[model samples]
Target chain A: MSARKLFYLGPQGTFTHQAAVNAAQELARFEPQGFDLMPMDDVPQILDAAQHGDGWGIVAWENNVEGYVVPNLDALIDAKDLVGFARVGVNVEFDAYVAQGADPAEARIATAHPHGLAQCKRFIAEHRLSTQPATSNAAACRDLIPGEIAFGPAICGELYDITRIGTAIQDYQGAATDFLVLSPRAEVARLLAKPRAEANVEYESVLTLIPLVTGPGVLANLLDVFRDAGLNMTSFISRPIKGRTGTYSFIVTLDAAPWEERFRDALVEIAEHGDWAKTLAVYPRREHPNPPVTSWMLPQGGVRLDDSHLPDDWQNDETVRRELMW
Target chain B: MSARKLFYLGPQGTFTHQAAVNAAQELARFEPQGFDLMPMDDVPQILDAAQHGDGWGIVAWENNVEGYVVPNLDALIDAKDLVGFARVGVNVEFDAYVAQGADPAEARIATAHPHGLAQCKRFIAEHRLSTQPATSNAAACRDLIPGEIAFGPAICGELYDITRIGTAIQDYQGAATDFLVLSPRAEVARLLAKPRAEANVEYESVLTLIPLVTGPGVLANLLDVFRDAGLNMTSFISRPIKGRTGTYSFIVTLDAAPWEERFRDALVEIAEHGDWAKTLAVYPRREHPNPPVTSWMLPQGGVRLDDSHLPDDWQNDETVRRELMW
Candidate 1:
């Protein structure tokens, strides 16, 4: 197919941009053809573009460390045509910090991606270093003015322009949601196969409520239903849906596998809008894929390259992977 | 007033963040209240909270370089209680490069924030590192096994954690933004009196519109109304407003002096559901009693402060203190 452009909120130097690029790359590799990139300032624009065949869009869906990028998640609902592709595992986020001075000890200010900055708020505040927000952590590092007696430490991809005063400042333990790819159902399977690493990848779905209502455990009960369903909720977030009053949405990352039969009963009680609420779409389970893996890190740890390629000591490695589970 | 927690997407890594923090700090020093930092995934959440009386929020209103953040501007519409506090300048961005690992590089697996990454796509594809579906650039790095690799210069908060043998690669340049502060009307005046250097600040009335129709010259004509009215177009963003079908919203940032005049005309033009618009809301200007500074490193060009004998210039530093203009 001709190289079609996927316009998203981009210009590089953004995690969202990177996610879009990665997601598109995987899609083009497996799907039809012609995958490209473009810049967009808003997620809503992305969906609009998708509808107009501006190509599929990749926008921020949620953050493991932060929370759902509320407006974007709402956009997904609005663009029912779009669906998720994958979720990342940010089990431990690296922190970005500011390093100042020739001796590098005057420490007064620090900078990073807003998300990182927030996750590491305690450490930053305790140090009395005022945190500054940046488009990205790497961008934060790039903005450092030399000999000013201070600098910002970025997580990764920021080297070459500014010096790294510190390696990681805002160590976040939360992951973020990548824009799940938007495509016809026929294309999903083909697209999923393109990513070499995701050969055995699985998926799940989540939903949202209008205007983020929270009175007497509205969200609380819904969460419990999934838990009881053996659906294994991996990630969930609630944020105000922009534009409308009290309109809020939720993005929940669930187990890649379908929920257990007994847990299915919870669907009746947990259905917010209707017993047959539509699925938002599925995404690769970064934290909780369908078939449980033995270890966390990847194939090397016994997750398996293509399943049969299990680590050397299969059973033992499987045991070890299971132990690493919780 | 007690010290208020200033929320920006931060850890102060980006230049704009630094600018925002610096600006916030300037205000804090002038008033009994200080600026506390908080990390936010989205600006609207912050705006919503402030509007609902939960806490104060500092948001990026406009940029000297890039321009406006649409959603934040849209939220400002109809928020009668909120006001603009100050503006700050920041000089932070990103640098891109390929990781220097012994492993083979696929440079095709590029990564970055959605916006930044898009800016670099022309370059990324030129180099062929544009594969892989969306995922955290850092996570991609972390996912790389000893023998495998994904190329990237992705930006945003760092992985904050990675298990890869190498780090994120990147491309670099100087691109920055200015951050604007928003809060209740009274807070604007309190933040402007300080002994710090600051940039020119302007208050502005904001608006949100979903295009009843989409196409060329449509937004330009709408902006022309402001232009013809003799108002400077300080910032502009036309983006998908949200889940509305084919609906889009544009954020208009203009100087404060003529809000009433232009707003009147804007309303008449968008009166119906189809005059190039669907819905609209306009609100009071975010007043800047004083010019805003930044939330990052201290000011550029050195303005020293000695305790015992405050410099003679301290008494009348234009940057340190000023009465803002529309």
Candidate 2:
């Protein structure tokens, strides 16, 4: 059997590359013919290649810190022939590297993607190194010189034959990114037809909706359909259509598969109402932390009407307007 | 009277700088002292300066192409003292610039921020120029040298004293960005107390809400408050709270000011329901081109339930699952 090609954002050792490798390993268990991992310049190129059936594409979908990779999300929504089949998560960990046998003390510059450099600010400050930004974290490590310290994914150390001087050196921890594995629409049926360990597995789906009607309750009404159907939505965002002011397409992440009765019924009602709806992706549900929003987690400002004690004339008080910053 | 300071993200000639200038001019009409515009490194510094009463700050709020500037949004939400009083919009127009007396044909490198470079791809390709990314569009123009063409806002030509070779060179037209003029909460009353041309004016507000409760319909129910109050929501997005999994704080842009009866009534309900709500900014409503989501404007792939012709037994048909890509 020939190896299937898996495309990722390149020049290797990117977080997307790490995710593609992880996805390929899991996928290889079912279809023993492995994957030929290829790297592309950007998400659009990957989408184009995948749509043409040149290969399966992997693209970053979201980061816990930065939220959705909007460009990729927009690309995926607009893509006609591509759909995501698998989802993978990668931790945003950066390891410091130097040329083999190079003295870390002699390093005069710290280099990475600007974001990576920002994330490891403490280390950079301690070393008294000047900053130089690269196109990407992986690229920084790939082109690391003897007098510069590079920060990137741990894979970069091995890939670039550099010595790892520091592990997980990013200032803040728990930052993670999610990537989607996309394939052509024609492959969906064949892939789903393959044998599975679990027949009744729960699924999560990313869906986009465009309400033909416009007004106050348009979105509220659309979401009410999912609520009424007892479907749980995990994420939702409104993006402008082609940069048109006041025109939006809502991207929604829900905890039910489209094939399920409740989800299908919800779609039917939405369709019956003359709205445009599309399922962007559907995969087996992953375990979510599902933590509750506690009071302490809230940001510093903003009116917390519930906790604040105000007099009966609170609305008349100048404090009300000031507090609300209205 | 001494001129009040107005800080913006800049080394001048940035879109934010342009917005700051526009906002300052409008503000000067009332105060008559004008503003001493200062450029800062980033949004956080602007927020800090504004909070300390050093000056007012202007930060990019949203872009039609990119959606919300999430980092800035998060910073504003987390800010303890700063709140926006005015909103400004700037068209995302780019002009190609060359050094004075330099031959345009000799220009070998096209320089700007990566985003600027990407937007001016057609012009760059036509010029057959290699790309050299800069820290910003303004910086690119400021540092333009012989044999290099820089792409930036039209103001860059005047600011950098560079010759404009081409105008409105961006690949796409109608791209626009909105910025917020921020001030400390303490300044709201004094600012609003000033006499206005019209006693009653329509206003728009950017607000954030965290539903202390979780699960199905949480968002739908919260938005229902506005729906029931007959208030119109212009924009809505869900952002994760501090990168926590499954936690989100909903940011909403609506057409009513917080002081208005209908909006206040809705907030009372939200407060009584124990959800945390904050009004991020309030300003006189700007005219929006509220175009409807017509059929042709929708993206290519998603399931358009209303227009999709399907068999009555669509659920059972393999084509249904294939189209949905479940």
Candidate 3:
């Protein structure tokens, strides 16, 4: 296999690129290979490059604060056949990167990816700085001319030759993202059969499914199959089947190893229960501390998967799901 | 009621502004009063204005082409008390707005709301025009100061003192957006008791519900309540429970009029069936021609509520639900 070329969400200096490089390093322990990393602008394009070209693609799947990356889920759901080989935890830190030789305090404008800007809302609001959204945080820094200021991951400042004016400027500390290593069907099959699952053994599986009919309790019924099977679902979100607006599809990530017969049987039950289902990706899973939210919901400290908000039968279900998944 | 102020998603000339103005006109037909229309930047802000102040706000809830307006759903789900009073059809027509003294053929830089830009992908690619994302299609036109070129609604060109170089340049012939007229709970209650519903009677109702539990076959079962009750559901989407990452809440629109006993019973059944449920709004409905799509799924034409794609049992259910609701 030509494992030399790997495509990732990028425009250079993007967190996605950094995540890809980090995961590529992890991949070397299993396959002992170096990769010629290529950066693609969007999640679909990265997946597209991997499917049409010979390579794997990496994308940011979820963030501790931003939640799931919407387009990635949309694209994966749009194509059921695509599979994921691994998930890597990427520690993300946002910083204010100011133009070299520019006085940061005097700079009235800041720019970064929408999420990047959002993450630094406190700093921006405190300083009364206006922001412009760029395609990526890296691009925000890269587009900076002599005296422009921007906020992005610290790496962007280093990579784009900008000066880091503020470090760890995000509203919350220790914000991190999970990146999924995506590959075509054949490659995913080959990777799954490899001994990597047995070697390290920790894995989280991703599944995409749609109800046979888009109706009221169908999604609830589908979730019960996993709940009844003792499967712990970590993330669940609904996405539209692209080009078919109003029609919907859903994806969920579980804290289950793919090789387990129990999980496999659950997948069978899922596909049987739902009109269609597919296992998109499965790989080592990592957990991060939920970001601190002082003024956020409930007016309490940062919340972790709280079941109190759930109905009686559903409330303790999350506690069990969390314990089982963890 | 001091119904002098109205907020809309805007920078003055966006489609939301147009939609808001259109709905306000409709509101006047019933109340015979004037409104002070104010433009707000985002859906949340516009809705926030109405929530915190005394005013009505309008937001694009869905487009026949691009699907649901996500943020509006998110905000509405977060607060059950916010209610919608009307739903207006805003037929979106994207045109290439030319800058002063700029030749249309020589122009290469085009801009619009992301959807507008997306809707005109073929024209953009065929003309090899580099594009920019704008806050809105109207803002895209307004941003063209002088000797600049952009593409947006022709109405934007007219409102912004620009020239329309091309008309109806969208990929789809009849892209239309559905706007929801939102007001405080008090206002919604007052509006509902008015003669509005009987005046023209065709209506679509929006509902927000959370399954008492998130378990398998639960969503299906919830939907079956609608089916059994003879209610026709037109749209459904899942949104995150604010501050909770893994949990979800859903919003659905039904063809059933809320005031009807059959529909009200379904809501009762829906609440009894799910952990919690709320009727957010019921407004007069208007049928729209789905935008044309040659390269789209199904390949033949713009899609409507199609039962052919559903499973055997569910397929025929839509037929019954359709006739009963209508």
Q: Provide a comma-separated list of chain B TM-scores, one per candidate.
A: 0.46, 0.92, 0.77
Please provide, for model 2 over B20-138, each residue's C-alpha lDDT reduced to its tens digit, 9 standing for 90 to 100. 88898778775587899999977788999999988889999888767678889988888888778899889999999998889898999998876788799899889999988676789
- DockQ for each numbered candidate: 0.01, 0.58, 0.11
lDDT of each residue in A194-307, candidate 1, tens digit only: 432333335455543321223233433444455444554443333333322223334444454223233234433433222223245555555423322122111111111223
- CA lDDT, candidate 3, residue B169: 71
In model 2 chain B, the worst 10-residue window by lDDT is B192-201
**C-alpha displacement of A159 in model 3, angstroms?**
0.7
**What shift in Å separates residue A307 of candidate 2 from its native position after superposition?**
8.9
Model 2, residue pairs in steric clash: A278-B303
Write the residue-wise lDDT of candidate 3 on B16-67 in tens digits.
Answer: 7778678778888655667888887566677677888567778777765455
**lDDT tens per residue, model 1, B1-326:** 55676666543343334554677666664546666566665666677667576556677654422334434554554354565545565543433433444334444354443344544555565556543322233333434433333433223234323223323223334333556666654343334323111322333433344334433334434545554555543233344333222234455444542224454455444432233221121222443222221211221121224433445644244422211000
Q: For residue B216, give model 1's deviation from the true position in Å.
A: 52
lDDT of each: 0.44, 0.82, 0.64
In what order do the candidates fall by DockQ, top score first?
2, 3, 1
Q: Native-vs-model 1 lDDT?
A: 0.44
Q: State TM-scores per candidate.
A: 0.36, 0.93, 0.74
Superposition error at B151 for model 3 (Å): 2.5
Candidate 1 lands at a TM-score of 0.36
Worst 10 residues of 1 chain A by lDDT: A295-304
Q: Say which candidate scores most in lDDT.
A: 2
